[PDB]
Ligand binder design. Sequence first.
Ligand SMILES: Cc1ccc(OC(=O)N(CC(=O)O)Cc2cccc(OCc3nc(-c4ccc(Cl)cc4)oc3C)c2)cc1
Ligand SMILES: Cc1ccc(OC(=O)N(CC(=O)O)Cc2cccc(OCc3nc(-c4ccc(Cl)cc4)oc3C)c2)cc1
Lengths: 264, 271
Amino acid sequence: SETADLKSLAKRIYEAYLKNFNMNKVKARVILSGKASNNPPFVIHDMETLCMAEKTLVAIQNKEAEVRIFHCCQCTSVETVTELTEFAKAIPGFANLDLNDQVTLLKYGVYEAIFAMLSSVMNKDGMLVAYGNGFITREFLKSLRKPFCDIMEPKFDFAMKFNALELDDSDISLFVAAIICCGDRPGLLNVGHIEKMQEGIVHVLRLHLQSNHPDDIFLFPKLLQKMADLRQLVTEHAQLVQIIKKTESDAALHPLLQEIYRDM
Amino acid sequence: SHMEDSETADLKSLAKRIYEAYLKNFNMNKVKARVILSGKANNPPFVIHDMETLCMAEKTLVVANGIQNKEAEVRIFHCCQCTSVETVTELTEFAKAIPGFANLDLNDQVTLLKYGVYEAIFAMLSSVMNKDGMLVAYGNGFITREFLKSLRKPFCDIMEPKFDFAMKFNALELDDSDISLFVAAIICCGDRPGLLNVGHIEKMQEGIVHVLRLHLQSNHPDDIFLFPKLLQKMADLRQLVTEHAQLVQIIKKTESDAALHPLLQEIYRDM
Ligand SMILES: Cc1ccc(OC(=O)N(CC(=O)O)Cc2cccc(OCc3nc(-c4ccc(Cl)cc4)oc3C)c2)cc1
Ligand SMILES: Cc1ccc(OC(=O)N(CC(=O)O)Cc2cccc(OCc3nc(-c4ccc(Cl)cc4)oc3C)c2)cc1
C-alpha cells in the first residue's frame, strides 16, 4: 500500500494542531453543551455584563463599549496568529519553503484560518470568549452602534453553515493546513514548491474525510466551497476594519495586525 | 489657610460625575470636534458646499432611499431631524445620569427634557461649528455656512442664527467640563411650564448652578465674569429656541413636502 504514509501525515498534522491551539472543537463543544468540569460560561448580553466580564475575566476601560470589544478581539486574534505560526512550522515541509513565501503564506492565510477555527466556538446564540470562560451573545453584538454591529454577523452566518458539516478537530487540522499552504497567494516566489506541498495536504484531507465521514462522501467538495467562502469573508473583513480606521477616532489597530492587513 | 473641607469635595465630586456622564453619553464632544476642525485627526471630513457634493455625501454618509427625489432643502431638513432625534436620546440618557434627576417626579423628568432639549442641542452644536461650517455625520462630513445660506427661503434662515450664537459662545473658550455643567443647568430648570413639583427642581437647579459657578472660577480663574456671561447665554439660547420653533412652524404651515419626525412634533407641541 501507499496510503499509510498519508494516514501518518494526517495524524502528525492533527498532533501539531492539538499541541498548538489552546481552544479546539472538542473543548468548545464540552463547554457549550454544559459538560464542563466546573461552571457554565459567564454570559455577556448587555453593557452591565460586559463591564463585569472586563473586570473579572480578562486583564482601555475608559473608551466606548464598541472600542473596548474591538480591542479585546484584537488581543484574541494576535494570540491565534502566534498559534497558527507555530502550527505552520510543524507542518511537514513548510519550514523548507523560501523564507519570504513562508511569511506570505501566513500573511494571507491567518484570517482564513482564524474564521474557520472561530466557528468551533460559535453557536446560533453567540460565542465563547475569554479562554472559554465567557459567552458573548450574537444579539448583543448586533445591538451595538454601526459599523461595529456589522462586523461579527457575517462570521456567524459563515459559522452556522460551516458547523452544519460537523467536522471534528482531526478534519479541521487538515483544512487549516490546506488554507495555509495555498499556491494562489500574491507575491509568491516559488509557487511550484507550494503547489506540490498543497497537493499532498489536499490528498490526505480528501482521504481522511472519506474515512472519517463515510455518511457523506461529498464532504470534501463541500469543504472546497467553504474555502472560497472564507476568502470572500476575509476580503469583506479587511474592508470593514479599514472603515473603522477611516471613520472611528478612538479605535486603534494593533501593529502586528496593521502589518497583516497592509497591501492585501 | 485651611485644607479643602468635605463640602467642596462634594461639589467637586458632583462636577466630575456630571462631566463623566457627558463623556459617556455624547460620542461627539468639543475636544474631538476641535481635533477634526484643526486638521489634527486620519481621513479629512467630506466637504458639502454645493449641490453636487450634497448628492455625493447623501450617497456615502447617509441610508435614506425615501428622500432621493425630494428638493435639496427638504432632504437636508430630513437629515438634520435624524441628528436632532439622536441628540435628544443622548440628552435623556445624560439627564438620567445627573445625580438627583432620577429622583424627580417621572412626569417632571419628561417635561424638563421637553423644554430643555433644544437649548442643550444648540449650546452643544457650537462645539462642532466654526466660522466656515459645521461637522455632520459623526465628524465624517462638513457642511459649509455659505452653502446653507445659499438655499431658498425659508431654509437659508434656519442655521445662520445658530452660527451667530456659536461664534459668540465659542469666544468664551469653554471646555467639555464647563459645557457638561452648563447643559445640566439647562435641563434642570425650575422655570419650565407645567412642573408638578417646582420646589424639588429649584433645589436641584440651585445645587447645579452652585457647582457650575465654582467649577468656572477654578477652571477659568482669569475670567471672574464668566459665570454671569453664561447666564446671559442661557437667555440668548431661550430666544434662539423660540425663533427656531417659529421657523419650523413656518415650514410646517407653508411647505408642501416638508414633514416632521413624530417625536419632534411632540417636543414642539405647545411650546
Ligand atoms: C465590535 C467588534 C469589532 C471588531 C471585531 O472583529 C475583530 O476585531 N477581529 C479581530 C481582528 O480583525 O484581528 C475579528 C476577530 C477575530 C478573532 C476573534 C474575534 O472575536 C473574539 C471576541 N472576543 C470578545 C470579547 C472578549 C472579552 C470581553 Cl470582556 C468581551 C468581548 O468578543 C468577541 C467577538 C474577532 C469584532 C467585534
Ligand atoms: C435646511 C435646514 C432645515 C432645518 C434645519 O434644522 C433642523 O432641522 N434642525 C432639526 C430639528 O429642529 O429638530 C435643527 C438642527 C439640530 C441639530 C443639528 C442640525 O444640523 C445638523 C446638520 N446635518 C446636516 C447634513 C447631514 C448630512 C448630509 Cl448628506 C447633509 C446635511 O446638515 C446640518 C445643518 C440641525 C437645518 C437646515
